[PDB]
Structures are given as structure tokens and as C-alpha cells.
Amino acid sequence: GFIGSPTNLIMVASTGACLFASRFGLAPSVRKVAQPLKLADREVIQTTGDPAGFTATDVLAMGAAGHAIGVGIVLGLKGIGQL
Amino acid sequence: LYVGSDAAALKYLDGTLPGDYGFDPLGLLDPTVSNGQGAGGFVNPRWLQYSEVIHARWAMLGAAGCIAPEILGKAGVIPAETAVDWFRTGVIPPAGVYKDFWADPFTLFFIEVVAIQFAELKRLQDYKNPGSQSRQYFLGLEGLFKGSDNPAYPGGPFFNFANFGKTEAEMKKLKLNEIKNGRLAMLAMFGYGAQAVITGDGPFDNLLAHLADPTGANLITNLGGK
Amino acid sequence: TGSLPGDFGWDPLHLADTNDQDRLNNAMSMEWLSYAEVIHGRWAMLGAAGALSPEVLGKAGVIPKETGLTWFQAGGLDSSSNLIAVPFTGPIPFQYWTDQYTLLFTMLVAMGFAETRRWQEYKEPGSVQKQFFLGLEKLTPPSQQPAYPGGGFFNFAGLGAKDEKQMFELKVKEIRNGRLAMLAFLGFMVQAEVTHVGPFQNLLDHINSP
Amino acid sequence: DRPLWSPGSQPPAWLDGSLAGDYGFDPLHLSEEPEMRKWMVQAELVHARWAMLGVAGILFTSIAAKNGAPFPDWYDAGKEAIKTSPAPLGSLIFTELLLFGWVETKRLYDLRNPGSQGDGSFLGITDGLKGKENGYPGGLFDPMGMSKNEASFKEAKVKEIKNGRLAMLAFVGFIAQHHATHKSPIDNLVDHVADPFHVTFATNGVSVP
Numbered sequence: 001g002f003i004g005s006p007t008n009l010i011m012v013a014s015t016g017a018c019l020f021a022s023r024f025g026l027a028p029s030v031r032k033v034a035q036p037l038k039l040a041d042r043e044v045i046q047t048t049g050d051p052a053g054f055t056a057t058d059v060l061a062m063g064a065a066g067h068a069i070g071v072g073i074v075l076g077l078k079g080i081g082q083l
Numbered sequence: 084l085y086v087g088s089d090a091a092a093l094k095y096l097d098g099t100l101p102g103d104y105g106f107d108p109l110g111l112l113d114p115t116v117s118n119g120q121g122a123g124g125f126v127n128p129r130w131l132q133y134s135e136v137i138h139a140r141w142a143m144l145g146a147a148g149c150i151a152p153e154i155l156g157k158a159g160v161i162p163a164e165t166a167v168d169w170f171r172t173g174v175i176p177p178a179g180v181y182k183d184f185w186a187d188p189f190t191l192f193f194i195e196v197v198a199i200q201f202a203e204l205k206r207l208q209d210y211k212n213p214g215s216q217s218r219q220y221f222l223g224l225e226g227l228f229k230g231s232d233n234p235a236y237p238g239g240p241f242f243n244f245a246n247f248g249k250t251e252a253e254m255k256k257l258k259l260n261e262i263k264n265g266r267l268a269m270l271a272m273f274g275y276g277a278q279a280v281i282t283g284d285g286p287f288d289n290l291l292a293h294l295a296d297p298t299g300a301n302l303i304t305n306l307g308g309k
Numbered sequence: 310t311g312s313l314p315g316d317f318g319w320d321p322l323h324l325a326d327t328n329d330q331d332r333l334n335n336a337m338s339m340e341w342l343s344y345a346e347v348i349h350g351r352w353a354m355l356g357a358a359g360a361l362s363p364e365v366l367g368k369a370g371v372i373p374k375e376t377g378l379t380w381f382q383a384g385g386l387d388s389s390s391n392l393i394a395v396p397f398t399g400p401i402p403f404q405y406w407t408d409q410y411t412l413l414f415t416m417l418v419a420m421g422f423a424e425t426r427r428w429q430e431y432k433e434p435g436s437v438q439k440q441f442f443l444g445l446e447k448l449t450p451p452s453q454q455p456a457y458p459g460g461g462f463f464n465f466a467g468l469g470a471k472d473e474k475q476m477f478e479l480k481v482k483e484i485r486n487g488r489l490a491m492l493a494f495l496g497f498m499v500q501a502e503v504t505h506v507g508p509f510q511n512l513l514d515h516i517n518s519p
Numbered sequence: 520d521r522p523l524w525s526p527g528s529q530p531p532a533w534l535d536g537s538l539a540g541d542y543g544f545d546p547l548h549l550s551e552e553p554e555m556r557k558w559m560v561q562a563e564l565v566h567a568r569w570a571m572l573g574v575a576g577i578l579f580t581s582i583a584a585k586n587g588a589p590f591p592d593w594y595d596a597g598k599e600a601i602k603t604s605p606a607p608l609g610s611l612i613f614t615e616l617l618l619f620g621w622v623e624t625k626r627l628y629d630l631r632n633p634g635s636q637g638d639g640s641f642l643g644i645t646d647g648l649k650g651k652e653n654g655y656p657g658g659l660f661d662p663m664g665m666s667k668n669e670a671s672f673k674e675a676k677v678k679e680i681k682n683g684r685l686a687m688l689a690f691v692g693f694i695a696q697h698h699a700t701h702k703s704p705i706d707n708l709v710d711h712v713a714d715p716f717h718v719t720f721a722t723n724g725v726s727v728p
């Protein structure tokens with residue numbers, strides 16, 4: 001919440017890591033399918049200038065995932081007495 | 084440019100609508116939705132466009148009526164006692180009610196509901212039956228209620244007495260600008276309601292607070308964050 | 310295309326090339342975009358000149374330094390009613406020959422007259438000069454291109470009677486320097502906003518400490 | 520052929536230049552219907568005429584007050600007038616309404632039907648109270664006839680509409696000055712001519728907070 005707080009830093013890092021994972025393979029996305037690996041799919045939604053398969057629902061889903069991972073990490077570290 | 088046009092939504096809509104930026108993620112303008120005969124459901128393109136333009140006009144009037152009293156009361160145009168916030172006029176008596184009025188707020192509500200019921204019921208009957216309000220004698224202003232093929236744009240000697248847009252290009256530009264300003268005012272009234280709930284002040288007061296201190300008065304600082 | 314000046318193809322945002330290329334209305338035709346760009350560039354030329362003149366002329370001692378102050382303080386660009394950047398609102402320390410709002414009203418009247426003349430020439434060329442204008446209608450001759458009217462008033466030196474290749478070279482040089490003026494005025498105003506000092510002061514700071 | 524509101528503008532099809540002050544300044548496309556054209560012409564003429572009557576009265580009272588006559592400012596002069604007049608409030612408003620109803624209904628029904636008042640209905644008067652034009656009456660209203668010749672009549676129509684337009688601009692200027700400076704208009708003009716470079720619309724007025 002506070003600018004410069006450790007929770008802000010690590011949750012911004014988590015959201016950016018989720019976005020970077022969605023941009024380049026890694027995390028499954030709209031254009032990524034199949035259970036074991038990730039395979040190319042239909043474009044589904046126009047990306048509106050974004051290269052590769054990166055649409056609005058992609059950034060919405062992975063921002064939600066990043067916020068969830070960040071709040072889980074924050075509360076887990078607060079439970080164990082860490083940052 | 085198409086503002087965030089979702090793919091596979093252009094398959095059923097071409098460019099005929101004023102705005103028509105191709106933004107339809109969930110999908111409601113599809114003719115396959117509510118296909119048949121008769122009244123049907125409420126999700127049909129004609130009613131969708133009609134409700135969109137009516138929401139646009141009402142939101143534009145609301146944004147004007149939310150800005151004008153506070154702005155003119157900040158200066159000497161409107162006196163301070165009549166320069167109340169838009170939600171403190173009496174629309175929400177918990178928020179505030181202006182007691183110094185020429186009539187009781189419920190009397191004004193009854194007069195308003197009678198007048199707007201006449202207006203919107205004539206509008207609805209013309210929407211169901213085009214040009215029907217010009218046949219039955221109302222007051223002698225039946226020729227003013229001729230209407231048009233599109234219920235969203237009736238025209239006539241009163242609704243468009245300036246007869247702007249003689250050419251089709253000017254009609255298209257005017258319709259696009261009307262729907263654009265209406266969508267902008269819809270988002271505006273959304274923000275006005277949000278600020279009225281959170282800040283408890285007029286939208287111009289919030290604008291002045293953001294102007295004076297950007298980081299010290301914003302959405303983050305509104306709800307307690309830093 | 311290469312007919313328009315500065316047709317380098319640098320359009321990554323694709324804000325140009327709309328389907329409705331009507332010059333009248335829609336505010337998005339390529340001729341209207343070029344006209345707006347060139348007049349914004351000429352106003353940026355004038356703004357850079359007027360934001361560099363008083364400081365360096367007071368430094369050189371040609372004008373007295375009491376009136377050779379920075380541009381935003383001498384332009385009324387102050388806090389005022391917490392508006393940051395609104396001209397003719399902030400109080401100016403130096404008293405002038407008249408009130409600020411006096412030439413703000415002359416601003417409104419005179420620039421409205423000039424802009425309405427330009428808009429009427431854009432809408433219908435060759436018709437503005439027909440009406441009586443106290444003998445000033447012949448001062449501005451009509452032209453096919455609204456961005457480059459020409460004539461005695463707009464071309465006093467007469468350096469436009471040469472061949473079209475040199476004229477196009479002058480045009481592309483003018484708009485390239487206009488884009489340079491765009492960047493220069495953007496840097497001017499953001500440095501004046503984040504430093505609250507004149508551009509000459511931080512320019513000297515950058516020269517002394519690169 | 521004629522000067523317009525903008526150089527190069529196209530005059531409206533319903534404005535052929537046959538009216539007084541026909542500069543074609545009709546951007547809201549009003550008076551397109553011929554009956555609406557008569558209505559707008561009569562409304563502009565009546566509003567302009569009352570504007571210049573009121574402006575002449577206000578200016579005369581202001582210059583007399585500056586000269587030394589015991590006359591108040593044009594603002595709130597009605598309060599001291601009703602304090603000094605033997606007639607109480609409400610009564611004289613109703614009497615002037617009774618007097619104004621009559622002539623204005625005659626004007627309205629002459630506007631709807633020209634020559635309707637020349638039938639001798641009002642005291643047997645037939646030549647008088649007859650509209651020579653739509654918004655321009657004749658007969659009893661004009662004691663001596665400089666309107667008999669047509670060229671000077673058209674010139675006087677143009678001069679009347681332009682002086683009336685200037686006077687209603689002067690009336691909105693009057694209300695703006697007395698809501699901004701709260702001084703007499705003659706005093707405002709004296710203040711402007713005394714120090715034009717300092718006594719402006721913003722230094723002394725409330726126009727700028």
C-alpha cells in the first residue's frame with residue numbers, strides 16, 4: 001500500500017513476474033493451451049497493438065493472479081513474523 | 084481507430100452505428116440473440132441503441148446539472164445558499180435537503196412524475212408504433228411528434244428545429260459526437276457518484292483537491308492509502 | 310506517400326489514415342492534420358522564441374533585467390487558483406502599461422477575428438476577401454493550400470517565387486524545425502514545472518555540470 | 520451583394536436581405552417558417568425598441584445624477600420610486616398591465632392578420648393604427664411622415680434596428696456593470712476615460728475573483 005513499503009515492493013514484483021510469465025511462455029494464457037506444456041491457440045481477442053497473444057482478458061487474469069499471490073505472500077510472511 | 088475492439092465481435096456488426104468502436108466482449112448486439120417475432124426480450128439491437136442514446140442524453144444533462152451549480156456558486160454567479168452539492172439538493176434527504184424551496188420536494192416529485200410519465204409514455208408508444216403520437220389529438224402539437232424511422236432520432240419541427248446536418252456526413256459526425264459526449268458523461272456521472280459516496284463533496288471540490296495536491300488528494304489517499 | 314512535408318512514415322500509433330478523409334468536419338483528415346501540425350509548430354516556434362528572449366536579453370544587458378524575468382512568471386503561469394498552467398491568471402510582479410486582463414480581452418477579440426478568418430478561408434477559399442473589411446481584405450490573398458497562403462503580408466521578403474523543389478525543401482526544413490520546437494517546448498515546460506526556475510538557469514546548470 | 524455576419528458565409532434561404540439588418544446571422548435556423556419569421560421580426564423589433572427606451576431613460580437619469588439632479592442610480596430606483604409615489608405597489612403594476620394588455624393584444628392580432636385594426640373598431644379610426652409593414656405600423660403612430668418615401672424608410676428601418684441592437688447590448692452591459700462595480704453607468708464611463716490603462720473590467724469589477 002505505502003509507496004516504498006516491503007509489501008508494496010514484493011507484490012509489485014509478483015504482479016510484474018506474472019505479467020512477464022504470461023508474455024513469454026511460462027504461465028498459461030489465452031493463446032496457451034494443454035495440460036503438460038503450452039501450445040499455440042487462436043487469437044480469440046484482438047490484442048489492440050500488443051505483439052503476440054496478449055489481450056485485455058490476459059492482463060486482467062494475470063493482474064488478478066498477481067494480486068492474489070501478493071496478498072497471500074504478504075499475509076504468510078506476516079504470520080511467520082517476516083516482511 | 085477502434086478502441087479496444089474485441090475479435091469475433093465484428094462478425095455481426097458493421098459500421099452503421101454512430102460510435103461503433105467494435106467493443107463487445109460479452110456480446111449483446113448479435114442478431115442471433117433474441118431472434119424471432121413479436122416483443123421478445125429486452126436484449127435486442129434496437130432497444131439497446133435506444134437505451135444507450137437515452138442514457139447518454141440523461142447522463143449529459145445530469146453532468147451539466149452537477150457541474151453548473153457548484154461552478155457558478157464558486158464565483159458570484161449563483162448565491163451561496165443555492166450553491167449546494169448535487170446530492171444535497173433533496174435527492175437524498177440523508178445526504179441533504181434544501182428546505183428553502185418554492186414547494187415541498189414530494190410535490191415537485193409528483194409534478195415531475197406526471198410530466199415525465201406523459202413524456203416517456205408518449206415516447207414508448209411512438210417506439211412501439213412509429214408516428215402514432217402524430218395521429219391522436221394531444222394539444223395541437225401533434226405535427227411536432229411526427230418522428231422518424233429511427234426512434235433514437237425523431238427530429239421534426241421541435242426536437243430538431245435547427246435542422247442541423249442537411250448532408251449525411253454531418254448527420255454521421257453529429258451522431259458520433261453525441262454518442263461520444265454521452266459516453267463521456269456516463270463515465271463522468273459514474274465518477275461523480277463514486278466521489279459523492281467516498282469524499283462526500285462536490286465533484287469540483289474533488290477536482291480542486293486533486294489540482295492542489297495530486298498525491299495528497301487522489302483515489303489512493305481517498306480510502307486511507309499512501 | 311511523399312507529397313506532404315515530413316512523410317517519413319513514422320506513424321506507430323496509426324492516429325492518421327482514417328477512412329473519412331473529408332476535409333470539412335471530422336477533425337481527422339490528413340490535410341486538416343497537416344494544417345494543425347504546421348500551425349502548432351509555428352506557435353511552438355514563437356513560444357520558444359518568447360521563452361528564450363527575455364532571460365538572455367537581460368543577461369546580455371540589452372533590455373533591463375527588471376523586466377527580463379522568466380517566461381512563466383511573466384506569462385501569468387503561476388499557482389493562482391491552483392491551476393498550475395493557466396495564462397493571464399497568476400499575478401505578475403512587474404507592472405505593465407495596462408492590466409493583464411486588458412490584453413486578455415484583446416487576445417479574445419483579435420485572435421477570434423483572425424481564427425475565424427482562417428476558418429472561413431479553410432471552409433471556402435476566395436470568399437473571405439469579398440466582404441468589406443476596412444480595406445484589409447486585400448492584405449491576405451486567397452490560396453489553394455490553407456497552410457501556405459502567401460501574398461504580400463505573409464511573404465514580405467518574396468522568397469517564394471523560386472521553383473517548387475526549393476519551396477518543398479524550405480517547407481520540410483520548416484516542419485522539421487517545428488518538430489524540434491515541439492520537443493524543445495515540451496522540455497521547456499516540464500523543466501520549468503519540475504524546477505520552478507527559468508530554462509536559462511537550468512541550461513547553465515547543465516552546461517556547468519553535464 | 521450585402522455585408523454578412525461572416526466574410527464568405529452563405530446567407531440562409533429564408534433570409535433574402537429584404538428585412539432591416541439582414542446580415543444573415545441565423546445559425547440556429549430560426550424563423551424558417553414564414554409565420555415564425557413574422558414572429559421573430561416582431562419580437563426583435565419590440566425587444567429592441569423597449570431596450571432603447573429603457574437605455575435612454577437610464578442614461579438620462581445617470582447623466583442628470585452626475586450633473587447634480589437628485590436622481591438615484593438605475594439599480595433599485597423602483598424602491599425609492601414606490602417610497603415616493605402616492606400609488607402603492609401592486610396597484611400600479613396592475614394598472615400598467617391593464618394598459619399594456621390592450622395595445623399588445625392589438626399588436627398581436629395585427630401581426631396575425633394585417634389590417635385587422637383598420638376597420639374602425641377602436642374609436643372609428645381606420646387610416647390610423649394600420650400596419651404599413653409587418654413589424655412597422657403606420658397612421659396614428661407616425662404624426663409626421665418621413666416614411667412616405669421608400670428609400671429613407673428603408674434607411675430608417677436599418678438605422679432603427681442597428682441602434683436598437685446596440686442599445687440592448689448596452690442594456691446587458693448596464694446589468695453587467697452594476698452587478699460588477701455597483702456604480703452609475705455615467706460614473707463608470709468617467710472612470711474609464713479618467714484612467715483607461717488601470718480602470719478596466721477586471722481591476723475594479725467582480726469579473727475576476
Ligand code: CLA
Binds near residue numbers: 524539540541566687
Ligand atoms: C432576444 C432578442 C433577439 C431576437 C428576438 C432576435 C431575432 C432575430 N434576429 Mg437578432 N440579434 C440579437 C438578438 C435578437 N435577435 C442580438 C443580441 C444581436 C447581436 C449579437 C443580433 C444580431 C442579428 C443580426 C446581425 C441579424 C439578426 C437576425 C435576426 C432574425 C433571425 C432569427 C434569430 O436570430 O433567431 C431568433 C433569436 C432568438 C430567439 C433570440 C434567442 C436569445 C437567447 C434565448 C438568449 C440566450 C443568452 C444570450 C447568449 C444572451 C446572453 C448575453 C450575451 C449578450 C453575451 C430574427 C428576426 C438576422 C435577420 O434576418 O435580421 C432580421 C440578422 O441578419 N440579429
Ligand SMILES: CC(/C=C/C=C(C)/C=C/[C@@]12O[C@]1(C)C[C@@H](O)CC2(C)C)=C\C=C\C=C(C)\C=C\C=C(C)\C=C\[C@@]12O[C@]1(C)C[C@@H](O)CC2(C)C
Binds near residue numbers: 544545576577595690
Ligand atoms: C441581450 C438581449 C438578447 C440577446 C440575444 C442573443 C444574443 C441571441 C442570439 C442568437 O439569436 C441569434 C441572434 C442568432 C442565432 O444563430 C444564435 C443565437 C444565440 C440564438 C436582449 C436584451 C433586451 C433588453 C431590453 C428589452 C431592455 C429593456 C429595458 C427596460 C424596459 C428598462 C427599464 C427600467 O426598469 C429598469 C430595468 C431599471 C430602472 O432603473 C430604469 C427603467 C427604465 C425603469
Ligand SMILES: CC1=C[C@@H](O)CC(C)(C)[C@@H]1/C=C/C(C)=C/C=C/C(C)=C/C=C/C=C(C)/C=C/C=C(C)/C=C\C1=C(C)C[C@@H](O)CC1(C)C
Binds near residue numbers: 463490493497512
Ligand atoms: C536545448 C534546451 C536546453 C534546456 O536547458 C531547456 C530547453 C528549453 C529544453 C532548450 C530547448 C530549446 C529549443 C528546443 C529551442 C527551439 C527553438 C526553435 C525551434 C526556434 C525556431 C525559430 C524559427 C525561426 C527563427 C524562423 C524564422 C522564419 C522566417 C523569418 C521565415 C520567413 C518570414 C516570415 C514567416 C515572416 C516575414 O515577416 C518575413 C519572412 C522572411 C518572409
Ligand SMILES: CC1=C(/C=C/C(C)=C/C=C/C(C)=C/C=C/C=C(C)/C=C/C=C(C)/C=C/C2=C(C)CCCC2(C)C)C(C)(C)CCC1
Binds near residue numbers: 222
Ligand atoms: C435543464 C434544466 C432543468 C430541467 C428541466 C426539465 C427536466 C424539464 C422537463 C419538463 C417536462 C418533462 C415537461 C412536460 C410538460 C408536459 C405537459 C405540459 C403536458 C401537457 C398535457 C396536456 C395538457 C394534455 C391534455 C390532454 C389532451 C391533449 C386531450 C384530452 C386529454 C388530456 C388532458 C390528456 C431545470 C429546470 C430542473 C433546472 C435548469 C436546467
Ligand SMILES: CC1=C(/C=C/C(C)=C\C=C/C(C)=C/C=C/C=C(C)/C=C/C=C(C)/C=C/C2=C(C)CCCC2(C)C)C(C)(C)CCC1
Binds near residue numbers: 015060063064065068
Ligand atoms: C509494458 C507495456 C505497457 C504497460 C502496461 C502496464 C504497466 C499494465 C499494468 C496492468 C496492471 C498493473 C493490471 C493489474 C490488474 C490487477 C487486478 C485485476 C488485481 C486484483 C483484482 C481484484 C478484484 C482483487 C481481489 C482480491 C481481494 C480483494 C481479496 C482476495 C484476494 C484478491 C487479490 C483476489 C504500456 C501500455 C505502457 C506500453 C506497452 C506495453
